Amino acid sequence: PARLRTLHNLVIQYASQGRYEVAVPLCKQALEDLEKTSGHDHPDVATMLNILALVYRDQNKYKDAAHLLNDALAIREKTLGKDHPAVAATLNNLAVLYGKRGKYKEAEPLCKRALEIREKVLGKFHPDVAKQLSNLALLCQNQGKAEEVEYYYRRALEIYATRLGPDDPNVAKTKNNLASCYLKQGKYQDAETLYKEILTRAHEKEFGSVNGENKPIWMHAEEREESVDSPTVNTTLRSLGALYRRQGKLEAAHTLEDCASRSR
Amino acid sequence: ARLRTLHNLVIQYASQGRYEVAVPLCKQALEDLEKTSGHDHPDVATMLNILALVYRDQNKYKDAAHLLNDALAIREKTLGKDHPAVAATLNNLAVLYGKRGKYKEAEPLCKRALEIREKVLGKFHPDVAKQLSNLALLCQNQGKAEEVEYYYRRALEIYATRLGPDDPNVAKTKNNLASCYLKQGKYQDAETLYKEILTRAHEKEFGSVNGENKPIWMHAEEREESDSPTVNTTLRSLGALYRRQGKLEAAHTLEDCASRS
Amino acid sequence: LEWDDSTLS
Amino acid sequence: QLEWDDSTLS
């Protein structure tokens, strides 16, 4: 029905724009008009509810937002069915709210189910599944499930860099997180090798397939020991700089720190 | 299809008091219309009129006026001159001009509008009477005393005849015209007019006058010798005329009856 | 003065 | 914190 059909869109059209105050009454009225004809159960009621709770998130009315999305998923599951992408998206969303509240163990099953729905709909090695694994890896980081963090970020990388570009920032993000998860574990050389990889991916795109003369930043310093515009790669210079502080390679930690200093 | 619902929403929300909520809906709807049709279109004119009515309530009067001028410029090209929409707009944008104090500026607008109305409907049409009534006030503020009389007098010849005798519109006009007579010094004319009004009312209240059923004024003007708001104003207004006539008992009893209402 | 809203209605 | 998934409106 046009009456509702266009209004429903206007809600999205405005909530996205940032005109939340404009959106909320449209939403509210659309709700009362939606329930008159079709009732509580409807995919559009769910969509609209999600929009409302998305306003409540920004407002930091977290428990309300969470409850609202629970109701929305209860509607979404009956209408759209379990193992639906909408259901997955909702489970992902209402887990971020649960995580933010500090209910980390409560968000984990939601996320786990969501990932299982995503895998069913798309595939084992799909990028969204990877985004979900990345999301899931943080829920386990706060929990202190060190090994799981490694597994999930490790699985994420096997879906990122292979499907995506090697120089990609998402890939670097993951390789930076996973290398921190290794630092915690005591897998020091693994994290070191990871950081070297990160540096090399940027260094080659800036210059070209490295030769004796084109040598990378770390190789210069680790050799000096004997005798970068990116933020994600500056963090890397500093992070590897610490590993060389542990490795006793001071000159290396210094040259890395200096290069990082020169970038800011 | 597109306009059909938004047009309803702006109004739905403006009525609610959700002015801030309404104005952007209209504003975006405008830009979505201008994409396809541009400025030249009757709905663009309609939407603009809707916008300026929001600006009226907000007391952004010159903006509203300007907006309706633009709207009339669109309406005339699209709908054509001597159109009822054009007339309605000229009527509207004359009320804003009058309210602003531009009484002489509102007069040509109104004069043209009445001439469009007459062309479309007829010389003795009720809307034409409503327009004449509107014009009579623009001439009242100007101090064109005779014009006021002529216009309200013409209004009555199109009202009471076309309308029911017992109409409030007719009483409204007869109350205005009788004030315009009070100003002129046509005292007995205004007095007779007020008597007519009272007589129109007494009859709906009770059957037509008989020996004992006599009206309120006749009771008082005879005593002298030996519920409606528009008709309460009349009791008071005629009560003043008897104050002018020295017929105090009449003014006393009229005032009392008005007090009892 | 009296308004004439038929321009929107 | 965790990342939100907007495909419900987008």
Author numbering:
A (entry chain B): 195 to 421, 443 to 479
B (entry chain A): 196 to 421, 444 to 478
C (entry chain X): 205 to 213
D (entry chain C): 204 to 213
Excerpt from the paper describing this PDB structure:
Kinesin-1 transports numerous cellular cargoes along microtubules. The kinesin-1 light chain (KLC) mediates cargo binding and regulates kinesin-1 motility. KLC comprises an N-terminal heptad repeat region that oligomerizes with the KHC stalk, an acidic linker region, and a tetratricopeptide repeat (TPR) domain containing six TPRs (TPR1-6) (Gauger and Goldstein, 1993, Verhey et al., 1998, Wong and Rice, 2010, Zhu et al., 2012). The KLC TPR domain (KLCTPR) is unusual in binding to multiple ligands using distinct sites (Hammond et al., 2008, Zhu et al., 2012).
Certain cargo molecules bind to the KLCTPR using tryptophan-acidic motifs, which bind to the inner concave surface of the KLCTPR, spanning TPRs 2–4 (Araki et al., 2007, Dodding et al., 2011, Kawano et al., 2012, Pernigo et al., 2013, Zhu et al., 2012). Tryptophan-acidic cargoes activate kinesin-1 by releasing the KLC LFP motif from the KLCTPR (Yip et al., 2016). Intriguingly, TPR1 forms a similar dimer interface in all crystal structures of the full-length KLCTPR (Nguyen et al., 2017). Notably, we also found the same interface in our previously unpublished, 4-Å crystal structure of the KLC2TPR bound to a tryptophan-acidic peptide derived from calsyntenin-1 (CSTN-WD2) (Araki et al., 2007). The TPR1:TPR1 packing interaction is unique in being found in every copy of the KLC1TPR and KLC2TPR in all crystal structures, suggesting that it is independent of crystallographic environment or crystallization conditions. The amino acid residues that form the crystallographic TPR1:TPR1 interfaces are totally conserved in essentially all Bilateria and over half of the non-Bilaterian species in our datasets, across all phyla. These observations suggest that the TPR1:TPR1 interfaces observed in crystals of the KLCTPR are not simply crystal packing artifacts and may be functionally relevant. Thus, the KLCTPR possesses the propensity to self-associate via TPR1 in a manner that mimics JIP3LZ domain binding.
